[PDB]
Design an enzyme around this catalytic site. Sequence first.
Site, PDB file in Angstrom:
ATOM      1  N   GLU A  94       0.919  -1.335   0.038  1.00 10.68           N
ATOM      2  CA  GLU A  94       0.280  -0.114  -0.036  1.00 10.68           C
ATOM      3  C   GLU A  94       0.809   1.259   0.097  1.00 10.68           C
ATOM      4  O   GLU A  94       1.604   1.247   0.642  1.00 10.68           O
ATOM      5  CB  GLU A  94      -0.940   0.230   1.084  1.00 10.68           C
ATOM      6  CG  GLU A  94      -1.924   0.867   1.256  1.00 10.68           C
ATOM      7  CD  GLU A  94      -2.949   1.620   0.717  1.00 10.68           C
ATOM      8  OE1 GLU A  94      -2.300   1.562  -1.096  1.00 10.68           O
ATOM      9  OE2 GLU A  94      -4.287   1.044   0.449  1.00 10.68           O
ATOM     10  N   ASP A  96      -2.047  -5.493   1.034  1.00 13.00           N
ATOM     11  CA  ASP A  96      -0.885  -4.185   2.013  1.00 13.00           C
ATOM     12  C   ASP A  96       0.409  -4.261   2.385  1.00 13.00           C
ATOM     13  O   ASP A  96       0.838  -3.024   1.878  1.00 13.00           O
ATOM     14  CB  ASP A  96      -2.495  -3.605   2.479  1.00 13.00           C
ATOM     15  CG  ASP A  96      -3.704  -2.788   2.793  1.00 13.00           C
ATOM     16  OD1 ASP A  96      -3.971  -1.927   1.953  1.00 13.00           O
ATOM     17  OD2 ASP A  96      -4.623  -3.340   3.079  1.00 13.00           O
ATOM     18  N   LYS A 116     -14.537  -8.289   3.382  1.00 13.75           N
ATOM     19  CA  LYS A 116     -13.498  -8.435   2.879  1.00 13.75           C
ATOM     20  C   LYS A 116     -13.081  -9.633   2.427  1.00 13.75           C
ATOM     21  O   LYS A 116     -13.244 -10.174   1.049  1.00 13.75           O
ATOM     22  CB  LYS A 116     -12.467  -8.353   3.931  1.00 13.75           C
TER      23      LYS A 116
END
Lengths: 180, 180, 180, 180, 180, 180, 180, 180
Positions: H65, H93, H119
């Site tokens: 990320e 991420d 998610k």
Amino acid sequence: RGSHMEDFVRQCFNPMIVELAEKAMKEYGEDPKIETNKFAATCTHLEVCFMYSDGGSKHRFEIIEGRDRIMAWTVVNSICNTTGVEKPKFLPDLYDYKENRFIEIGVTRREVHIYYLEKANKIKSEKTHIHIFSFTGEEMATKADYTLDEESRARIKTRLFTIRQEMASRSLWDSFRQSE
Amino acid sequence: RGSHMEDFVRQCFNPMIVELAEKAMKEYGEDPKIETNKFAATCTHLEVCFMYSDGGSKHRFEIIEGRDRIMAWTVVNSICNTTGVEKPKFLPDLYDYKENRFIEIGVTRREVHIYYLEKANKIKSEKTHIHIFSFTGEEMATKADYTLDEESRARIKTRLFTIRQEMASRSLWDSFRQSE
Amino acid sequence: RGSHMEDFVRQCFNPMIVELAEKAMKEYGEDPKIETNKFAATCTHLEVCFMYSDGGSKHRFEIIEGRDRIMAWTVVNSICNTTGVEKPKFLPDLYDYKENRFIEIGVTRREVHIYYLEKANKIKSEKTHIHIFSFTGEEMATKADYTLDEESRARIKTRLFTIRQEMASRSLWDSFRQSE
Amino acid sequence: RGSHMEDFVRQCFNPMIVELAEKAMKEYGEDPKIETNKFAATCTHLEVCFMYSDGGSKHRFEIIEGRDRIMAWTVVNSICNTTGVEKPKFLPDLYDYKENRFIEIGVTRREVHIYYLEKANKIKSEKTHIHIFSFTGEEMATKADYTLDEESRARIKTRLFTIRQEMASRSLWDSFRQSE
Amino acid sequence: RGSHMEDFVRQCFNPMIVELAEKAMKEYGEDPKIETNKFAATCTHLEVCFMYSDGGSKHRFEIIEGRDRIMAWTVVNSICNTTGVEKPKFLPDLYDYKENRFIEIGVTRREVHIYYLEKANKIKSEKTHIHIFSFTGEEMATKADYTLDEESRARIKTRLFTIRQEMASRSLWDSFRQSE
Amino acid sequence: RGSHMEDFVRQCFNPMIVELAEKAMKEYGEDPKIETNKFAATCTHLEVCFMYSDGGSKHRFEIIEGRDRIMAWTVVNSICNTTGVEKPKFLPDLYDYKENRFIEIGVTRREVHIYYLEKANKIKSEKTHIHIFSFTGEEMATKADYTLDEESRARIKTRLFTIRQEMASRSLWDSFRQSE
Amino acid sequence: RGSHMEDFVRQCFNPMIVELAEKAMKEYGEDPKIETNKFAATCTHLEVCFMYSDGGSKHRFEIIEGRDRIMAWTVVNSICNTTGVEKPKFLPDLYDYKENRFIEIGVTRREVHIYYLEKANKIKSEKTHIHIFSFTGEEMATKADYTLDEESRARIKTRLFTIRQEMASRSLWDSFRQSE
Amino acid sequence: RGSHMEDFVRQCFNPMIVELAEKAMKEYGEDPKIETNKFAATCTHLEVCFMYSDGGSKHRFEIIEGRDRIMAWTVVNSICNTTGVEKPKFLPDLYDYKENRFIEIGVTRREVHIYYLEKANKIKSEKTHIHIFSFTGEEMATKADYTLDEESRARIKTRLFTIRQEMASRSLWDSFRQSE
Ligand SMILES: [Mn+2]
Ligand SMILES: [Mn+2]
Ligand SMILES: [Mn+2]
Ligand SMILES: [Mn+2]
Ligand SMILES: [Mn+2]
Ligand SMILES: [Mn+2]
Ligand SMILES: [Mn+2]
Ligand SMILES: [Mn+2]
Ligand SMILES: [Mn+2]
Ligand SMILES: [Mn+2]
Ligand SMILES: [Mn+2]
Ligand SMILES: [Mn+2]
Ligand SMILES: [Mn+2]
Ligand SMILES: [Mn+2]
């Protein structure tokens, strides 16, 4: 020791100026922790020399004060052997590339008339320009030639008077005044 | 090797100047650890070129010396193709945007008259301005046009004489003098 | 509190200016988190004072605004005891070494004519020079002597109008306008 | 993508200029990794604008190019509402506080005569000053008023020609030339 | 003077170490420009002390060597009056917070057996730990307790041998060896 | 004022610690130039808190002391609303993420037994851990749990005793001792 | 020249790594602008050596690669004359203070089995540890002793594969692959 | 626009985080000046990702990320082609070199149970580890494996709650809460 003046000098002046004054006094066998009035005088004289060279054009002045004696002399020989100026008997403070003369800077606690007299007596070589500054706010220069602008000299006198106020505010000015 | 002159050059000159001189000599197949007098001469010539461009106005000079040959030439083509000046046969040191000419800087150990002669002979193109400096403290420039102020040139001669004193103080000047 | 104006002041002005304004208001018993319009006014007045001293020559001005009151006064005494200028009744903002006078800087939200009048009334000592600036883009100075160049004053008015646009873009200008 | 021109632009120009050009193209829906000739043109135009403002006195110019559109406009309103100059229809590049006019900077790959014509046509408001630069080394300015010194303009043309040489040395100039 | 060893010391050691060694010798009435072997020994002993404290955990050691005598003692009193350790007769080099003992560091040019003997004789107070290092690459510590890791001690001996090689490469090791 | 203690505090402690102590006292209506013993006590307590958080692992402690009251509280709410710990009645100094408790740090001039008693009385909530330090070199912590390593606590006591020596060397300790 | 690979190497690797690789190739009579695949290989091998020493404990490794040959050897003699390890015939890359052995690092473009074989043949002295890395993501170390953690070695292989992707994305990998 | 939330985001978060969030939203066609709640969410999610990688050992995590999509993917391929892990369908991420798995970080405004469900549904590849954080102070991780220490996770929840307090103190939390 633990003197109020030593802690004031460290709080009042820039660290690089304190270190240069410390190195100067020790080189001449002086103790900044014991003789704190000379410690304050050396820092003041150093800062005045630095502001002086900061006046006028860039690279106009060559700073002699603040260097160790051997290197401070080395630059004097180079300036003399380059411009053809007589070698001064005693170490000066700056050299003026614009007026082609060395400058001896003084910071006195009495009237500027006396200090200049004692300075011009030691400097029997009348070639080195003399520029005295006083804490109260006067100045006396050779042949009434004060070299720098009025504004640059005014900044020096203002800072000089701030130091006196800071000392007197801590009840240390009278000892510094009767020191010289 | 372990020469006194190599350690003096590293202590005398600025690290960025030593690195540029090291890169210059190696590029031309020279060893700074072996031929230490040329190492000192390249650093001196480099520092003189840098102070020279520091004289006068900002962006007045374009620094050619110190760049690697390919890029140093690249800037020469751009200056020529912009101002319409003839391309120099050999690589110069600076370009004057104010006087619209290239400058070849020399630092000699003999009299400035000889060095200028050898310089003007190689530079058959009389367009490139020549400015010689000597360690003892002389200077010779083309058409008596010394380009910069008297004070900026004086700073260069003073530093030049300091280097000579530093070498002689370490008993390395005579080897450097008979080197050229 | 959590006011939009407080977060705008921190995003709009330089951190050193915000800290100096915070220290100034707290010293005078003011809360920057509560009275956020005075927080914006102090930052604006501070930045205008700093750009003002940035105009003209170096060391031309002595910055009084921004220092703590005791030291800000200390410099005023030194300037007076050096140049021979009368001591101002109220704390000024700068001192001009070139024109030998103190400067009181104003930043108003109404017409410059009113603000100058209220300023000149409090400053019964007509020696201190007055220079008002307005957000809309006017300026009024004593004896029509605006001290700095037209370009330096223009930079100040441009920044002043940018602050107004930034406030109005966040719907906080009307509160700031009716604040004064 | 993996284009030679993209890696050259990143190696040729300063990182802050590349980031500003990247932010500019993305804001207008342009891809620096795909349309690399416009990426090189935006960096070149940006660097020329920065050197231009670096010419002349300090705070003489207000840099409009390089800011995001909303803030770039915000400064334009402030300059107009301060000096009383008409608001330009299209975003200019700089503002001259000395001559009180906006400047539109151009960097062309053809003759400066054509580029100026297309520029003056879009800018129907004849108040904004125009100053074109060419890679080969020409320049055309409104009313033959080139604003800056000859030396500052010469530095720009020299750098412009260095970029062309660097591109041609990597066989990317012809694509950049036929791009415009 | 102009000694090869002085210029080597300045090129070999870190500037902060040279300054601390210079300040140490001058404080004890020693000239680094004249007695250059003691100048090299003080720098070496200083750097060894610094790497030693860099070994192990953070804040494990309190560095006594390198401080001026009055402050170096001041910390010794604080460590004694805090941990309850006897006050050393002579100034030590470090204090171990992990083993609760002072450390005297030695760097010898002969066999470590002799140097330790002379060190333990002067330090009649057997509480202070002793750790000798040799240029050739040996070490002798009190009670075979070498305090730090094998890797940290190995780094010190490696650097010690590099200094010897650098001196011998410049034909200055034999003078340094017969100095002690 | 011009007190010896004020200039000592500025020379003894780190500038960021002096500024934080100055901001703390002014926020609570205290004058560091007048009540200089509380100025020294706040700096000492601040530095002890900072070294304490520097002990142990990284991010082990959350520093509450030194922040302005509103933000210092804001972090307390977050720590409570995250870990489920009761909200302290009075502002603590740190929070231990490893032991899940707040820490109240004390620096006393009398015996640690009295200071802890007065601290535990005000903190009627027995959840907040207490850790007292003394200038002479003692420490008392809740449930004999001293949290940090012996070496980290030893560093704090050593620095504490250095401050006492520095004060007594300037004949200011007795005033500081009878201050509490 | 103007090669895509040269501009990629400058954009891909850290400036200090590019300078060290440039200095290494020139010292061995190699041109980074002409033989750009060896320029990429030297940077890659250098960065792998630096990450390798960054793995594990601090001061665990002594970095030999990257130094100029004379000084790189000087450290090898010191390590040998300190730890008692045989002098390697060829210059290694690192030294492990924890395992007391030199390390030769390899970065291959074929299978790690071949490269190790050629490496172990030249290094007839079986004392120097060998650790090969591949771009695709393999590694072969002497006696299956890979020295560092799995995570530190994984970081190296990940970066190695990123370089391959960056090259292939610019259509320069196949030339780099068939280079070795 | 001139939203209170935009100025709060710039005052609340670190400048490098704001710039990365700005670049992220613009790349995906989002306006930080218009949709300021997503601007706050991206900064929060970014800072949580950075603190997460700051937990545990050095070089334990690879930060995905914050990088631009093309390079963020490039590192994913390298990690997969090095460790042999399946390529994730969506961009994760971080990557854990210690546990050899990618991590998807979530910061929710509702209960952590819902956010994790949404998610895990999108991430049909059950190999990527999931770690949700809530503003109120909960966390849910795959297989109850929360990866980092309790203290590192506690620091994240504390900062998360500080952001909520800062928003609510400015009456902007309810808009941010009903945003998700
Ligand atoms: Mn003198
Ligand atoms: Mn004098
Ligand atoms: Mn040349
Ligand atoms: Mn030359
Ligand atoms: Mn005011
Ligand atoms: Mn005012
Ligand atoms: Mn434009
Ligand atoms: Mn344009
Ligand atoms: Mn010792
Ligand atoms: Mn407290
Ligand atoms: Mn406390
Ligand atoms: Mn190698
Ligand atoms: Mn290798
Ligand atoms: Mn996520």
